[PDB]
RNA sequence: UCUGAGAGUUUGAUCCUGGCUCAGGAUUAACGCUGGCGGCAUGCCUAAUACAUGCAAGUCGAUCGAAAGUAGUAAUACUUUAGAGGCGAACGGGUGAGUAACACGUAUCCAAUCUACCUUAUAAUGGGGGAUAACUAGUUGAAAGACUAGCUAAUACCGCAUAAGAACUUUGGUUCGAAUCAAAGUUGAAAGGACCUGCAAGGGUUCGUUAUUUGAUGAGGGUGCGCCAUAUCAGCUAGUUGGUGGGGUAACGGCCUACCAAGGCAAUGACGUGUAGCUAUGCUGAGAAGUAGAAUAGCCACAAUGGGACUGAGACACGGCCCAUACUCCUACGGGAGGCAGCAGUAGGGAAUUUUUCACAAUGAGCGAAAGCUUGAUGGAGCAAUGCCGCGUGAACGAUGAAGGUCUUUAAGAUUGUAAAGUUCUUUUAUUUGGGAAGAAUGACUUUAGCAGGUAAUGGCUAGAGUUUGACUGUACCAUUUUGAAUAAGUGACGACUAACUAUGUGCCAGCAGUCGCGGUAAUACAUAGGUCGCAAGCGUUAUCCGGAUUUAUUGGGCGUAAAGCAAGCGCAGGCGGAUUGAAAAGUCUGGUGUUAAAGGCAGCUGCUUAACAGUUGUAUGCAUUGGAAAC
RNA sequence: GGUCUUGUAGCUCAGUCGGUAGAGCAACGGUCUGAAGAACCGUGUGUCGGCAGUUCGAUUCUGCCCGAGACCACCA
């Protein structure tokens, strides 16, 4: 989380597996506000499929987010 | 773990008294070794009592050194009180922080000014239940002289305020006990049981917030300035505020770590002889003769008026009067502070007798309250003793 | 400092009044010169456009009961928006919560209104408010409290209200609505806006 | 400190022994090819180079470069 | 604190600096002293700038007299 | 879109040029005074000085042998690992002394390169051998440890058959040194485990391992560009410059080596000197531009110093190794052990800067069929008004004017002054009760409902359930919760610049002061009092940044007498320079593309109760390049 | 933390095992200069940091502190 202390604000983190937190991002795919969710969560989802096709597997906390936006509903479809 | 302390027994502070060169070190080692067999946490403290030059090079005592040892019934914190007149200021400090008193006086070298001054000081400090153990009893032909020493100590107890009836006069030898002879070790067992037959445990109260008085401060590598002392009132946990009284205006600080002779505590109750490291405090700001307290009841002053029971010349006090510029050094509970005797109106001299409430101003303010016993010494001999009964400020 | 500690003296010296002019017209053979043990005969040490500019700034900011820091920060905030900065700023000067209540006429001193608002006794849109520096918006519902209907000063001034067209309210439920911006006639005329507003260039 | 350093060193003792043996055996094969040039011995050198290439002993280009520079002089025949 | 030696003035009433007593310096420009353009802290850690300077006691170091 | 202040200071006195100071903000701030509180931010720049104690990198019994305990007569089953195997340990953390040149950044070339784990398609899971750890017995030693004789496992190690395809070339094919094909020769692979099905054979799914390979990623190199001061610093350089053969390299390469030549840079400033992490950025002004390089991020080096090298895809390796150097520790004096510029912490210096705090809950990362474990990373807490913002130090009424003090110094008044008392109200806070957030609108657990190439099912996709993950939390917030105007302001100046005046004292003695300048016995300047003014929960001081400083004059000076025209001239480079026709676009302008990180500078919106703060939206100059313009 | 040393005029220092309190600056009344300073005749101050022995005699011997000054603390 980055922002005001005691105020969570963590945007998406899907970067190369050997990159530090809040370093030089590979790409920005929307943003997320853990302080207040439910119409403060959004991803571009445009180049997301390509980024998945080139490494950078989703982490534990973003599987739901991909299922939230329907990415998981077309993830296994695209692999086949 | 900083060798965490464990306590399950009533904590008392015992202490040896007498004139040095009689073998105080060997007697302390003998009693510690005797109680080592009765339970652990007790080691032979013979050369562990010395930390100053000529204190080990000669084999004498200069300062009040503390050791600790538990038992199946009671815990004890032993304190060594030195002789070497003009060093009495050290031993009264031990009187500041002891509960039981063990007299160590030689027989063939029967009572000298040192012993009488020590007993008188123990009387005027406010510590009861003196215990007398005869030493150097291994000396041959001690039939008619051992009874003489017992009678002399019994009569000398009364000569200053104590009594020579309630406490039995134990006898035996410590050098042979140091060697490990079973009979004299049994005599030391008997002395310890006699101690257990008196000197009740201190009362535990929490209503009064917190109070402690420092014995000495010292630097500890990687930690900082660490002070010693003993809790008087209330409890104390790790990370609480404190106020500093003495020699300076009140100074607010915070504690960092509580230990008991480098044995860490978890819940420091009232009456425990321990030491504390504070948070961001300078060693030149807290010294020996200072007080830690909690806000709500404390007020420092330099000039105050209190009653004094002056010691007559027949009792060893001054045989002549003095002026309003007369400047003794009073020894309040844990503080050795010089104060002039600025006698108020209708008072210009304190001779033997004429117990009048005197007013004195001290160089350093002290945590004062009615009922605080203290003594007056000047010229090499103690000249008076009293308690706080009036507060002008 | 938040509260000056005295209100009459500042108006006595700067030649203005907290109210229109009723604050000081007669107080039992009251004075009219500038106060002080020596303002009776000598009146000036350095008076010019700059000095009168500071004087007008004081008569403004002490009238609105806001610290100098607050004036500077409001100037910085109005720098954010465009157009005639002085006119819009002067319009917002009476748009404060306690200022809005003062224009409603619920109290004859902004200090009292500040106390009422910061004590949590004023109700703004299903949310208690205790910070009298909230930005308003044309068309906002305002009310103080039903429970405060028993306050003697509120009851005394309920019928002796203040008629300011730019804000409308009803004293039956002590409820009104911020609708439209104010104008010059609705605002005090004893202070020259221009000197006050041009003096802030350092920030 | 880290306790997984003595383990690394003890693994490295055997690793270094094996690698030095393989490299000096390859060096011996290079000497043999120096003192005589034929087909079967060069095939043995090929086999040993690929044994090294089985593991990460030799870089993917080092073996290729050395055998190319060897066949450069092989092409004399 | 280094080998450099600087001249300075003693502001306030009286001079109580006494030949190896620790000092703290201060800046400021003056025109009265030929060769000296520095002042010394008067009223802190050795002196007091007496008192009653209710108008300036932060400068001219003096703790506020509490009554 | 946008925006520029001045004043005083020479002199009998005026003008011009010209200098000086002040009037603004700002800090990684400091001293002193004042001291309520919430939130936010921030809190060694100086001695890269050495460091008590603990910690920051471990991990996997379903990778394996073996051992121990427990249930158990036993078999076996559960729990654990001292070790072997492999993964990470080459990220992650901090510091800027050294480093003044690919240091940095940007764009291309990377036909001069690599890239295991991850992605696309896909090959295999054959067969043998030998040791060797744990262990047993010791030998030298207060200790690091070292040394031997014997016995065993593995997905350890070593060979061997074998091996689609891959690599080397021989002949041919495409092609502007690169790319693929055809034929010929040669070369090299290991490892199965777990579960399920089947009475066995055998079969199935999954994991990695080999044989690859299409990608991204990470790493590395060259070049154009400019990126401290240094002409009271003109010669420097001999693998130096170039060619030849050979070797290393992740590569091209004097990178190095054996041979042969004598070159290369430079007045458009080389060589050499002092200084320094750089950049984004932050600060300043409207502006071009000037300042520093907080924190935060990328790049670079570092691990007390100097070297060397083992390993592996990744090192000369922040908490690998050896050597020497220096300190520390002990030393039966035989000899070894350690390296906080990691969280902290002591000492010391410094004017100067916080805890040997909590949880690893959120996140990320590492490991692992799997539960799970760990992370002084990370998120928090406390101290410090260190800085910004908010909010309190009450409120209405109430005077021919309470009292006192001060001035007037004296028949009186004014001032303090609605200030005071008094009348009345109420509670951000003050003092506390009860209820009490979310962050677990993340992921995994379990049967499941449906479903997929597979069925006997595992592994998997979509939805359903909870005990599971709460230190913050007496938080926030709510209910007249109890009481309750009760809980709280100082500070600099008052002749001018610079908002504000009078009086008492000392009398050029004392002291002020930034300057003009104050005081030679009534000080609108000193010491002091009253009052006032201005700032403020902060206030003034030094240190130093830009404005003014146009005070280096691109913007924005010139050189008759205030400062400068060489003493004069000829003249190379260089700079500028008559006109017309044609060309192109080298410069120039324009449209498309990449880049100019995000945050910030600008504004809007949203969430912060609001402000501050956080997030979102659009957001510059610049280079390379495509397509044009051809007036200059 | 204890181990030693020091305290004398307004200031700086001398003060034989007591017999005076002694010098320098400041210093006051004069000599002198327009004036300030230089130089000259001279004033004088001295409870000896505070208490009891003791020297007939405490400031010259001690003990105790008071104010101050430096000296080292322990050892894995």
Swiss-Prot record, chain B:
Stretch list, region G2: 59-63
Domain of life, source organism: Bacteria
Primary location: cytoplasm
Keywords of the record: Cytoplasm, Elongation factor, GTP-binding, Hydrolase, Magnesium, Metal-binding, Nucleotide-binding, Protein biosynthesis
Pfam families to which the protein is assigned, alphabetical: GTP_EFTU, GTP_EFTU_D2, GTP_EFTU_D3
Positions contributing to GTP binding: 18-25, 80-84, 135-138
Domain tr-type G: 9-203
Subunit structure comment from the entry: Monomer.
Protein name (record): Elongation factor Tu
Curated annotation (Swiss-Prot), chain C:
Name recorded for this polypeptide: Small ribosomal subunit protein uS4
PANTHER family on file: 30S 40S RIBOSOMAL PROTEIN, SMALL RIBOSOMAL SUBUNIT PROTEIN US4M
Subunit and interaction comment: Part of the 30S ribosomal subunit. Contacts protein S5. The interaction surface between S4 and S5 is involved in control of translational fidelity.
Organism whose genome encodes this protein: Mycoplasma pneumoniae (strain ATCC 29342 / M129 / Subtype 1) (Mycoplasmoides pneumoniae)
InterPro entries: Ribosomal_uS4, Ribosomal_uS4_bac-type, Ribosomal_uS4_CS, Ribosomal_uS4_N, S4_RNA-bd, S4_RNA-bd_sf
Pfam families in alphabetical order: Ribosomal_S4, S4
S4 RNA-binding domain location: 95-156
Gene3D superfamilies referenced in this protein's UniProt entry, alphabetically: Ribosomal Protein S4 Delta 41, Chain A, domain 1, RNA-binding S4 domain
Gene that encodes the chain: rpsD
GO cellular component: small ribosomal subunit
Swiss-Prot record, chain D:
Function: Binds directly to 16S ribosomal RNA.
Entry GO CC: ribonucleoprotein complex; ribosome
Family statement: Belongs to the bacterial ribosomal protein bS20 family.
GO-annotated molecular function: rRNA binding; structural constituent of ribosome
GO annotation, biological process: translation
Protein name per the record: Small ribosomal subunit protein bS20
Species annotation: Mycoplasma pneumoniae (strain ATCC 29342 / M129 / Subtype 1) (Mycoplasmoides pneumoniae)
Keywords: Ribonucleoprotein, Ribosomal protein, RNA-binding, rRNA-binding
Pfam families hit by this protein: Ribosomal_S20p
HAMAP family associated with the record: Ribosomal_bS20
Organismal lineage: Bacteria, Bacillati, Mycoplasmatota, Mycoplasmoidales, Mycoplasmoidaceae
Curated annotation (Swiss-Prot), chain E:
Coiled-coil stretches noted in the UniProt entry, renumbered to this chain: none
Superkingdom of source: Bacteria
Family stated for the protein in its record: Belongs to the universal ribosomal protein uS12 family.
Subunit and interaction comment: Part of the 30S ribosomal subunit. Contacts proteins S8 and S17. May interact with IF1 in the 30S initiation complex.
Functional summary from the UniProt entry: With S4 and S5 plays an important role in translational accuracy. Interacts with and stabilizes bases of the 16S rRNA that are involved in tRNA selection in the A site and with the mRNA backbone. Located at the interface of the 30S and 50S subunits, it traverses the body of the 30S subunit contacting proteins on the other side and probably holding the rRNA structure together. The combined cluster of proteins S8, S12 and S17 appears to hold together the shoulder and platform of the 30S subunit.
Name of the protein in its database record: Small ribosomal subunit protein uS12
